[PDB]
Design an enzyme around this catalytic site. Structure first.
Site, PDB file in Angstrom:
ATOM      1  N   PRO A 196       0.827  -1.194   0.000  1.00  0.00           N
ATOM      2  CA  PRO A 196       0.000   0.000   0.000  1.00  0.00           C
ATOM      3  C   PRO A 196       0.862   1.245   0.000  1.00  0.00           C
ATOM      4  CG  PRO A 196       0.007  -1.048   2.133  1.00  0.00           C
ATOM      5  CD  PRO A 196       1.160  -1.587   1.364  1.00  0.00           C
ATOM      6  N   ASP A 197       0.325   2.340  -0.516  1.00  0.00           N
ATOM      7  CA  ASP A 197       1.076   3.577  -0.623  1.00  0.00           C
ATOM      8  C   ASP A 197       1.090   4.504   0.610  1.00  0.00           C
ATOM      9  OD1 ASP A 197      -1.263   5.096  -0.983  1.00  0.00           O
ATOM     10  OD2 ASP A 197      -1.080   5.171  -3.073  1.00  0.00           O
ATOM     11  N   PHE A 198       1.315   5.786   0.401  1.00  0.00           N
ATOM     12  CA  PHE A 198       1.368   6.731   1.513  1.00  0.00           C
ATOM     13  C   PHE A 198       0.109   7.563   1.718  1.00  0.00           C
ATOM     14  CE2 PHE A 198       5.806   5.783   0.703  1.00  0.00           C
ATOM     15  CZ  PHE A 198       6.218   5.468   2.008  1.00  0.00           C
ATOM     16  N   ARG A 199      -0.428   8.083   0.607  1.00  0.00           N
ATOM     17  CA  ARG A 199      -1.429   9.171   0.592  1.00  0.00           C
ATOM     18  C   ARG A 199      -2.818   8.829  -0.026  1.00  0.00           C
ATOM     19  NH1 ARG A 199       3.578  11.329  -0.059  1.00  0.00           N
ATOM     20  NH2 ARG A 199       4.229  12.751   1.624  1.00  0.00           N
ATOM     21  N   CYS A 225      26.226   1.758  10.913  1.00  0.00           N
ATOM     22  CA  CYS A 225      26.058   1.920  12.343  1.00  0.00           C
ATOM     23  C   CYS A 225      25.841   3.391  12.615  1.00  0.00           C
ATOM     24  CB  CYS A 225      27.277   1.448  13.101  1.00  0.00           C
ATOM     25  SG  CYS A 225      27.212   1.927  14.841  1.00  0.00           S
ATOM     26  N   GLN A 243      11.682   6.870  -5.824  1.00  0.00           N
ATOM     27  CA  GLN A 243      11.491   7.252  -4.447  1.00  0.00           C
ATOM     28  C   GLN A 243      11.246   6.057  -3.548  1.00  0.00           C
ATOM     29  OE1 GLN A 243       8.541  10.940  -4.388  1.00  0.00           O
ATOM     30  NE2 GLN A 243       8.476   9.980  -6.392  1.00  0.00           N
ATOM     31  N   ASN A 244      11.136   4.856  -4.140  1.00  0.00           N
ATOM     32  CA  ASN A 244      10.714   3.665  -3.406  1.00  0.00           C
ATOM     33  C   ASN A 244      11.892   2.995  -2.722  1.00  0.00           C
ATOM     34  OD1 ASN A 244       8.133   4.075  -4.448  1.00  0.00           O
ATOM     35  ND2 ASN A 244       8.285   2.399  -5.988  1.00  0.00           N
ATOM     36  N   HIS A 250      15.750   7.742  -2.470  1.00  0.00           N
ATOM     37  CA  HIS A 250      15.342   7.800  -1.065  1.00  0.00           C
ATOM     38  C   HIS A 250      16.044   6.706  -0.281  1.00  0.00           C
ATOM     39  CE1 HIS A 250      11.428  10.380  -1.742  1.00  0.00           C
ATOM     40  NE2 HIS A 250      12.536  11.099  -1.783  1.00  0.00           N
ATOM     41  N   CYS A 276      30.619  -1.304  18.498  1.00  0.00           N
ATOM     42  CA  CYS A 276      30.261  -0.279  19.497  1.00  0.00           C
ATOM     43  C   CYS A 276      28.882  -0.453  20.183  1.00  0.00           C
ATOM     44  CB  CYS A 276      30.370   1.122  18.907  1.00  0.00           C
ATOM     45  SG  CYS A 276      28.951   1.559  17.869  1.00  0.00           S
ATOM     46  N   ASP A 279      11.389  -0.313  -1.747  1.00  0.00           N
ATOM     47  CA  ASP A 279      11.048  -1.755  -1.842  1.00  0.00           C
ATOM     48  C   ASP A 279      12.059  -2.612  -2.635  1.00  0.00           C
ATOM     49  OD1 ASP A 279      10.273  -1.381  -4.652  1.00  0.00           O
ATOM     50  OD2 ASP A 279       8.285  -0.717  -3.928  1.00  0.00           O
ATOM     51  N   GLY A 339       3.224   6.811 -11.018  1.00  0.00           N
ATOM     52  CA  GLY A 339       2.761   6.452  -9.710  1.00  0.00           C
ATOM     53  C   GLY A 339       3.342   7.283  -8.596  1.00  0.00           C
ATOM     54  N   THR A 340       3.327   8.583  -8.786  1.00  0.00           N
ATOM     55  CA  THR A 340       3.688   9.437  -7.675  1.00  0.00           C
ATOM     56  C   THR A 340       2.825  10.708  -7.570  1.00  0.00           C
ATOM     57  OG1 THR A 340       5.433  10.746  -6.626  1.00  0.00           O
ATOM     58  CG2 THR A 340       5.588  10.419  -8.982  1.00  0.00           C
ATOM     59  N   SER A 341       2.709  11.228  -6.353  1.00  0.00           N
ATOM     60  CA  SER A 341       1.929  12.450  -6.091  1.00  0.00           C
ATOM     61  C   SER A 341       2.845  13.665  -6.123  1.00  0.00           C
ATOM     62  CB  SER A 341       1.309  12.359  -4.714  1.00  0.00           C
ATOM     63  OG  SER A 341       2.335  12.416  -3.742  1.00  0.00           O
ATOM     64  N   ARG A 394      -3.075   7.689 -11.322  1.00  0.00           N
ATOM     65  CA  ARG A 394      -4.499   7.805 -10.981  1.00  0.00           C
ATOM     66  C   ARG A 394      -5.000   9.250 -11.147  1.00  0.00           C
ATOM     67  NH1 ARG A 394      -7.989   4.124 -11.257  1.00  0.00           N
ATOM     68  NH2 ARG A 394      -7.129   2.755  -9.624  1.00  0.00           N
TER      69      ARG A 394
HETATM   70 ZN   LIG Z   1      29.247   0.933  15.719  1.00  0.00          ZN
END
Ligand SMILES: [Zn+2]
Lengths: 273, 8
Positions: free
Chosen positions: A34-37, A135, A107-108, A127, A162, A110, A198-200, A224
């Site tokens: 599922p998407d974000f918005r 780390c 931007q994905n 992204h 660490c 996945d 497929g982006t807003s 869409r």
């Molecule tokens: Zn570390």
């Protein structure tokens, strides 16, 4: 005003041969993510007892450092392995195989672009990625597999040296984007067609890339809904194919003469996964 | 500097 069929002809007539692509979470909903918005289904609407104080925290550092378990829960769910690419990814792959892909900007997080066989060199993961981790204390880098077992086991990954939390190289809010992103300086002027899928376009600085192509360059949206500058200030060579992205992609594939090759490629793909 | 990931 150009049509989908026009864009197909430009490609078929080899008038357009250096395609750059921009994608968002809309290309992965048809695979089950599922998407974000999107109202109802989108992660920024619906997640009670995701244990998040509000949904945007998922990718916010202060919250991650207070409690990293929600983020690793999404990591467990999204670990390259338990979702498959769909027709939209295979179409991108086919753009690469037919020698048309200048670059794919995603931007994905996945990983489905890489899973589908598009090579890293054609890919800008704007992204960030789960391919590697760092780390958070001592900055030692780790391959992304070194934390696969921890996430399956429901442990928070930690640094053997660490004891600090180890975090996949996903971009959180407020952080700049990987330096690979700087390839846009070269890519966008070199492009002779832009595809947006497929982006807003509500996240920066990724969104602003729509403006970086020359004015003679067609910008094709399959989505869409109308969004960004195709919504608020169209250029004359803009084209919107509104509807379900897989349907928009299936029409285009048909206008291009690639329908058998596509379904072939799936075979050797979704089969051999 | 001003190139961080943000919603518009
Ligand atoms: Zn570390």
């Amino acid at each position: 005003k150009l049509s989908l069929q026009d864009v197909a002809e430009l490609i078929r007539a080899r008038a357009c041969q250096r395609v750059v692509v921009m994608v968002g979470a809309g290309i992965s909903t048809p695979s089950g993510i599922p998407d974000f918005r999107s109202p109802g289904s989108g992660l920024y609407s619906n997640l009670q007892q995701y244990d998040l104080p509000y949904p945007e925290a998922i990718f916010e550092l202060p919250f991650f450092f207070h409690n990293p378990k929600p983020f690793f829960t999404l990591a467990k769910e999204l670990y390259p392995g338990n979702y498959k690419p769909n027709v939209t990814h295979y179409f991108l792959r086919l753009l690469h195989d037919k020698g048309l892909l200048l670059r794919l900007y995603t931007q994905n997080i996945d990983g489905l672009e890489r899973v589908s066989g598009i090579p890293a060199s054609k890919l800008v993961e704007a992204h960030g990625t789960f391919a590697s981790a760092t780390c958070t204390v001592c900055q030692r880098p780790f391959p992304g597999e070194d934390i696969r077992a921890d996430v399956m086991a429901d442990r928070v990954p930690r640094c053997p040296v660490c004891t600090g939390v180890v975090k996949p190289d996903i971009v959180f809010f407020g952080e700049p984007l990987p330096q690979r992103f700087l390839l846009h300086v070269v890519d966008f002027p070199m492009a002779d067609l832009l595809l947006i899928l497929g982006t807003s376009l509500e996240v920066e600085p990724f969104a602003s890339l729509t403006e970086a192509v020359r004015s003679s360059v067609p910008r094709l949206l399959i989505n869409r809904d109308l969004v960004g500058p195709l919504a608020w200030h169209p250029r004359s060579r803009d084209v919107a194919q509104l509807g379900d992205v897989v349907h928009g992609v299936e029409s285009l594939v048909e206008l291009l003469g690639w329908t058998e090759e596509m379904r072939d490629l799936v075979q050797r793909e979704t089969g051999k996964l | 500097t001003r190139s961080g990931k943000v919603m518009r």
